[PDB]
Design a protein around this ligand. Structure first.
Ligand SMILES: C[As](C)(=O)[O-]
Ligand SMILES: C[As](C)(=O)[O-]
Ligand SMILES: [Ca+2]
Ligand SMILES: [Ca+2]
Ligand SMILES: [Ca+2]
Lengths: 534, 534
């Protein structure tokens, strides 16, 4: 019968990626540290409220040679089993060719027929294998296509190559029998990026194919500097907000408003490829709240990129319940947020009233708790417009001990959406110590003293920015440096030193409390002298 | 072994089309009035100096139905026989899908897979059939592709469709075995037109395919108004000259100069689709001289469109030896031409010296003949710069009788290139007569009195142009009107009257002698009254 492609895509909301699994580059799907897929994982993801699952698959390393490129039947049966489990749990399912994109498909520019033969063979095999599967199984032509080994090197000829890949995929699937005459097909922009020319090119391809069951796909990992924590973008601010609005306005105008539905096939923050701790927690939450709201406004179905770091695949729970709670709330509507998820108290100072700005997002404050205890309006706190004041005696009750670090929590409750949690932290000025070391393993002894590090600047004392990405003084969190809180050390990485010339560099460590600490390093070959502020 | 595609295309020069033959829409190749192809025709064309032959083929009407679309083997064997004869005569050969373009291929926009299945099947069959043939046989994907039933309705989506047709053709041929891995392939622009965007799109496709044996093709039928004789363009003038220069500069810059050779797969004058007499003979000759010179300058191989009207296929000679002689001369270099191919003498007037402007094109005048008799320089004629004077006594010797029409010829001989022939014509004022008739068969009795008609204007006496193409007063020769010299009649066609409203129209007949005659028609329904000048 007829299929309503817009309703189909709407019914997928929200989605989840089985990341770093069948897409892993290796003998099998455990190559990147995830376990073999259990039925329970799929059940649990469905129970959390996900309505669709993307199962990215890298076929390279599980296929024979030319000319037929036979897919390993054992590998295919394992992929198949997971597809079936998902369908049994009433999920929509998307499969693709994944890291094949940069393992070999990218060669197409100087190997047209060679790539085409291999690509055709794979999609002929998959389309045939899955032809009688329910149409809740959809096919995606290729992940993040590009035709250079590098990102951001899209040339004019590349667009034509991607049109051809998308088109041959369409032709193969549509004429392969079973339900494949109507099965929804997912087609990407170049690099799954959102610039207007790339959206236009995908539109041209979709328009040409003259088919009612096509879905456009893009990916999104945040405004780059915020997403990796570089260049001073420690807060979710106007640049990150405007990129989302502008990008998804383009997507909506070009596709959704013209009747072509859009699946955001992957989203997250790029810096999570390091770890989730590289983005300040409150700012991370506000990114997800804002993004998902604006996707909802534009009818865009989204699928979380989860490489194993969000849903714990061994215990079937979220590593970060706060993040999940925010996402789950965002599926339904907006949550109120605040300038920060913390209130800092200087150890030794008289504790005063803390006033913080809320962004209510159309909700009302219903209550406040201090370590779970209900507070009395007026007596213990005030809300004046969007200015929330937590009274001194409440903070003193939580943190009069003056123990450094997080003493407790003030939780703001709203009539709709997720609670917002203020971590109440006692701090003193952090102290770094002079030291001497080697570029391969350089650690500054550091007393964090209840502080959390936001970012680090590096400049040559003689002038100019030092280290990687020297268009900015603010170095990249994790990549160039890392706080080791348990070890009481500040790590400066070998990658940092690889892009530092011999000489004297001034470091400036910025902490979330507002504390700033300077430090000097002198590099002489592979040897580094650290000198604390005096 | 390796093939040098530029040398290959150069070696094709000059070419000839076996037109209105296998391309004819009908049961067989005689459907449009040409005889079955004889070996002698191919021999004779080769003997005239042609090095390549285009054999356009329309496959529709000689194929089975879906899904395999089997080509009639009998038809294919007849095409094959002609290909073999041409190859035996050492010619290069181009075959294609021809009027399939507008019989069904154009449907692709709203029938993507249906057209693709049929197109794929045909090229699979042809590529297989011809795979072991010498590489002097080349394949051309499709004639004059477009995706509307009408010309000049190229939309953005159409470019993508043509890229796909060209690309699938490439893929099929290149992987079909025999010599087809290296066989030269000919790819057209949309409508085989020469505008920059269309040239760019073909370049993009050729660049993408990353193959050393690709040939670009365009067609050319002259600046439109001159080519059909409308809007007053009775002379080969600056607009026709500039179109050639601009168009082929674009072609050279975009393709030839970048190492992609170009075959002009068809050329002629569009109006020849009526008959060759619609273009004044001298102006026709200058068009071909100028065109072929500029193609030579730009290394473009050309193939004459001959639907049966140039080379007489029954007697194996040129209908118009003067035209052939000009083309043959042009293969080697430029010919000198003149303002006209005629000298008019008014009957009853004293015969004076005739002075005409020559365009020497780098040649020198070596002599002059009057009816074949060598004339004496100085005594009988003078050349002053490019001004040729033929003395009165020479013209009087040719035309003292005062018989109306062509009395004889003055032939200019040059050190290089074709002779130029001046027809010496005696004329009197032409006379049209009043009459009454019907729109389906309206003839003005006409005493042409040694004159040749150039064009006819039609305007409403109250204002505005009358008849077809009413953006100009000058009507289209043949289509709207025709001189019947033997019948002594001026025909105004039914097609003319279909676009004339009831009322009074002033006609102005322009003759090559400079004589102008006005005439009035009054249209009342299907009845027409003609009133001669008084
Ligand atoms: C390294 As990625 C663009 O697959 O998140
Ligand atoms: C009518 As034609 C464009 O094939 O000369
Ligand atoms: Ca294409
Ligand atoms: Ca609540
Ligand atoms: Ca001569």
């Amino acid at each position: 019968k007829t299929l309503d492609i817009q309703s189909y895509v709407r019914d997928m909301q929200p989605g989840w990626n089985l990341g770093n699994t069948f897409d892993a580059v290796g003998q099998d799907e455990t190559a990147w540290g995830n376990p073999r897929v259990t039925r329970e994982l799929i059940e649990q993801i469905a129970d959390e409220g996900y309505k669709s699952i993307r199962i990215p698959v890298t076929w390279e390393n599980r296929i024979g040679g030319a000319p037929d490129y036979p897919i390993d039947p054992q590998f295919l049966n394992r992929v198949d089993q997971v597809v079936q489990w998902a369908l049994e749990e009433d999920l929509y399912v998307m499969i693709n060719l994944h890291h094949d994109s940069w393992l070999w498909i990218y060669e197409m520019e100087h190997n047209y027929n060679g790539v085409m033969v291999k690509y055709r063979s794979l999609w002929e095999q998959l389309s045939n294998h899955f032809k009688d599967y329910p149409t809740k199984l959809m096919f995606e032509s290729v992940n993040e296509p590009k035709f250079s080994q590098n990102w951001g090197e899209i040339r004019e000829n590349h667009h034509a190559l991607l049109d051809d890949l998308n088109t041959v995929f369409f032709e193969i699937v549509r004429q392969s029998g079973g339900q494949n005459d109507i099965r929804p097909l997912v087609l990407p922009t170049m690099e799954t990026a959102t610039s207007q020319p790339l959206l236009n090119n995908l539109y041209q391809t979709i328009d040409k194919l003259d088919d009612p069951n096509l879905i456009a796909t893009v990916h999104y990992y945040g405004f780059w500097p915020f997403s990796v924590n570089i260049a001073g973008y420690t807060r979710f601010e106007e640049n990150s907000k405007q990129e989302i609005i502008e990008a998804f306005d383009r997507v909506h105008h070009t596709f959704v408003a013209r009747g072509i539905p859009v699946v955001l096939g992957e989203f997250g923050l790029l810096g999570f490829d390091k770890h989730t701790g590289v983005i300040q927690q409150g700012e991370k939450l506000k990114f997800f709240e804002f993004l998902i709201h604006h996707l909802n406004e534009r009818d865009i179905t989204h699928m979380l990129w989860d490489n194993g770091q969000h849903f714990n695949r061994h215990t079937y729970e979220w590593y970060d319940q706060e993040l999940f709670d925010m996402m789950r709330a965002s599926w339904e509507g907006r949550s109120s947020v605040a300038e920060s998820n913390f209130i800092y108290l200087k150890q030794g100072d008289r504790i005063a009233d803390a006033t913080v700005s809320l962004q209510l997002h159309g909700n009302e404050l219903t209550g406040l708790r201090a370590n779970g205890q209900r507070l009395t309006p007026g007596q213990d706190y005030e809300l004046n417009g969007e200015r929330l004041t937590v009274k001194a005696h409440v903070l003193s009750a939580i943190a009069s001990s003056g123990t450094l670090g997080t003493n407790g929590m003030v939780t703001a409750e709203f009539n709709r959406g997720a609670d917002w949690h203020f971590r109440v932290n006692t701090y003193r000025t952090p102290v770094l110590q002079s030291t001497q070391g080697h570029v391969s393993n350089f650690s500054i002894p550091a007393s964090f003293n209840g502080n959390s590090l936001a970012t680090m600047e590096a400049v040559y004392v003689d002038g100019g920015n030092a280290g990687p990405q020297d268009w900015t003084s603010f170095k990249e969190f994790g990549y160039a440096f890392s706080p080791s809180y348990d070890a009481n050390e500040m790590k400066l990485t070998e990658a940092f030193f690889r892009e530092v010339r011999d000489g004297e560099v001034r470091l400036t460590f910025h902490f979330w409390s507002g504390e700033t600490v300077n430090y000097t390093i002198i590099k002489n070959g592979n040897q580094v002298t650290g000198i604390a502020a005096q």
